[PDB]
Amino acid sequence: INNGMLEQSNIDMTQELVDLISAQRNFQANSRSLEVHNQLQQNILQI
């Protein structure tokens, strides 16, 4: 136990920012897949 000190968070801003970018990219790719599946369904629904 040390007096005169406090602990900050144990987070690193660099890793968090890169994870923001990567998670956004994953979201975008999954949305593209969902859009493809909707387009296929609409295509069958127009015969």
Place this chain on the structure above:
Amino acid sequence: INNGMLEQSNIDMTQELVDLISAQRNFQANSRSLEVHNQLQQNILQI
């Protein structure tokens, strides 16, 4: 048993739509056959 989840229906809209098309086509063909049979009987009934 998993909590936080539900099961949807196990149908495929693509296959259901294709079966809709095929069943309509079968219906139309059989109606054509019935129409032909009625025409034959009417043809006999006019001698």
